[PDB]
Every structure is written in structure tokens, then in C-alpha cells.
């Protein structure tokens, strides 16, 4: 299970959140929680847009690494299970 994720918010100034820190998933045995990460990839240059906890999503069930599988996405997003799993993320098309 997942109690916390790495949190990052590009838009921290306008949203009034901190910019990073750890976010509690408030994951308590009824519904699952995951972490996620979304970032942009300007030609191998990578900037994180957001990173956090992520309500139960049958798509990231049984995922312990963050690999995104969509071809050349405008924005990359991935989620995984497992604390701070969002810490590192990777890309590997299908």
C-alpha cells in the first residue's frame, strides 16, 4: 500500500500550496491510493508539472514503477503504487 507520495506543484505560487514536500495519501483500507507524476519532456529536457497522491484508479493497479506508455504525449503522466513511488518516473512506449 501507499501512505504518501512525493508532491510537487509547478503552479504552487497561484495555487498557494507549497512547491514540494510529501503528501499523505490518506490511504486507509476501503479505497486505494497511488502516487502520480506528470511532466513535460522538452526534447530530453524534463520539467515536472505535478506529482502527488492519486485516488484509486484501476489503471495503476499493480504498478510499482512509473513508466508512461503513450506515444509522444503533449504531457507525460504516470502513476504507481507504493510509497514515494512517484520519486522517479520513466518513459517506454507500447
Amino acid at each position: 500500500e501507499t501512505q504518501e507520495c512525493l508532491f510537487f506543484n509547478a503552479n504552487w505560487e497561484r495555487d498557494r500550496t507549497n512547491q514540494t514536500g510529501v503528501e499523505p495519501c490518506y490511504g486507509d483500507k476501503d479505497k486505494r491510493r497511488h502516487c502520480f507524476a506528470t511532466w513535460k519532456n522538452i526534447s530530453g529536457s524534463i520539467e515536472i508539472v505535478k506529482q502527488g497522491c492519486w485516488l484509486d484508479d484501476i489503471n495503476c493497479y499493480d504498478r510499482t514503477d512509473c513508466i508512461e506508455k503513450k506515444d509522444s504525449p503533449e504531457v507525460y503522466f504516470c502513476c504507481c503504487e507504493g510509497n514515494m513511488c512517484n520519486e522517479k518516473f520513466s518513459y517506454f512506449p507500447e
Binding site: 502520480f36 506528470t38 485516488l55 484508479d57
Partner: protein
């Protein structure tokens, strides 16, 4: 036949919304469906209003209908979508997932 939650995955692609939601691609949404009848037991998570209306029915089915099986417990999901300005945005949506069904 009995009222029960059943699976249903929605796909934002199919829904048409593929260019605006960034994630997820679709979700486990589910839906209720099933008869809700006399003598309506446990596991039909019914309301008194429902039991009454059930008997009312049973006397004059001509008056009120039987109650409908419909969610009594729903979960939010998260989504990530783009805003008019193309900022990336995360918001959690209340009541999108059916956790449990019942008589109403």
C-alpha cells in the same frame, strides 16, 4: 435479477473527451441495475421510504412503482486535464464511482 453493482469501464476516448483529459484514460465507473422486490431484504440497502413504497406497490402495483436500484455509495476519482490556457490541472471529482447499490 436482484439489484447488484455491475462493471462498466468508461473511456474518455470514447466519451469523446480524449484531448482534454490528460489522465486517466478511462475509469472503473460501474452501475446499478436489478429488481428490487418483495420482501426486500438485507443487501438491498433499502430506505424505509423504500420499504413502504415496496409494500404500497404490492397492494396496489397500480399506484406507485417499485423502487429503483441505484447507487448509495460513490467514490471520487482524480483527473488531470488542461485548462483554456493550457495549464495542467488536477481536480478530484466527487461521485464518479459506484461503491455500492441499493433500493431507493
Amino acid at each position: 435479477q436482484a439489484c447488484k453493482k455491475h462493471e462498466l469501464y468508461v473511456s474518455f476516448r470514447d466519451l469523446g473527451w480524449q484531448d482534454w483529459i490528460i489522465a486517466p484514460e478511462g475509469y472503473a465507473a460501474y452501475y446499478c441495475e436489478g429488481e428490487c422486490a418483495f420482501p426486500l431484504n438485507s443487501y438491498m440497502n433499502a430506505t424505509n421510504h423504500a420499504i413502504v413504497q415496496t409494500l404500497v406497490h404490492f397492494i396496489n402495483p397500480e399506484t406507485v412503482p417499485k423502487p429503483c436500484c441505484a447507487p448509495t455509495q460513490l467514490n471520487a476519482i482524480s483527473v488531470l486535464y488542461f485548462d483554456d490556457s493550457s495549464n495542467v490541472i488536477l481536480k478530484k471529482y466527487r461521485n464518479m464511482v459506484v461503491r455500492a447499490c441499493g433500493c431507493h
